[PDB]
Design a protein around this nucleic acid. Structure first.
Ligand SMILES: [Mg+2]
Ligand SMILES: [Mg+2]
Ligand SMILES: [Mg+2]
Ligand SMILES: [Mg+2]
Ligand SMILES: [Mg+2]
Ligand SMILES: [Mg+2]
Ligand SMILES: [Mg+2]
Length: 157
RNA sequence: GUUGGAGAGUUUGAUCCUGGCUCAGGGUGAACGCUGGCGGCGUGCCUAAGACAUGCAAGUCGUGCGGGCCGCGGGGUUUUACUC
């Protein structure tokens, strides 16, 4: 039981003696809009055999999300490849402003409001796990003063 | 109320990066085409600081002052001219 959007598909080429041969690849999201969200990337001989497979990888590739009033806890930036991904919390009423692919992934993960830009290289797939990582790395006003300080926690609080 | 930030297309049998050209967004003192019922409020030589006919666009005070003129009313003479 997981709602699951789909990001992008492509046909890629191998080669051989006498004509080409192929394979297709399917970028897939997942996510209970309250918290969680996965991604997959699936290759297979005939198309929706892949689109189906890509759904698989996403179930294991899950990322719980710190979510806070439908928005992002602090600001944030991450590189991965030469594709540079930006997030930043928006207020109630500003909502999934983000190009093509963060929208797909942020929405389904459950964001109401957010701000966003994409950078340099724009290839989907990088900006895909650009942001899978951007989100693996969100940190919370409590996860946090119990990363630091928490040396001696429960004397503080 | 940190009030605020969407990208894609295209080099290759295909893939990753660089990189240019390109399109989507809003903007006008606008013009051009097909079309054109109205009203309010704006607004209208961006080009030749090229050349301009005709009319108007800076005058007002008779309580600063002396007369022209064209009359009008009243006076010195019995009537004229002329004069106040
Ligand atoms: Mg780099
Ligand atoms: Mg680039
Ligand atoms: Mg080609
Ligand atoms: Mg804009
Ligand atoms: Mg226009
Ligand atoms: Mg006409
Ligand atoms: Mg002029």
């Amino acid at each position: 039981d997981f709602e699951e959007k789909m990001i992008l598909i492509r046909r890629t080429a191998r080669m051989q003696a006498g004509g080409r041969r192929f394979r297709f690849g399917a970028l897939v999201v997942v996510g209970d809009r309250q918290g969680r969200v996965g991604l997959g990337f699936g290759k297979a001989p005939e198309v929706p055999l892949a689109v189906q497979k890509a759904g698989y990888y996403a179930r294991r590739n899950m990322v719980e999300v710190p979510l806070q009033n439908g928005t992002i806890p602090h600001e944030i930036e991450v590189e991965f490849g030469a594709s540079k991904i930006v997030l930043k919390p928006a207020a109630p009423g500003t909502g999934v402003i983000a190009g093509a692919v963060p929208r797909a992934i942020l929405e389904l993960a459950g964001v109401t409001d957010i701000l966003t830009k994409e950078l340099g290289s724009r290839n989907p797939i990088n900006i895909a796990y650009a942001t899978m990582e951007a989100l693996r790395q969100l940190r919370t006003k409590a996860d946090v003063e119990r990363l630091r300080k928490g040396e001696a926690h429960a004397q503080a609080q």
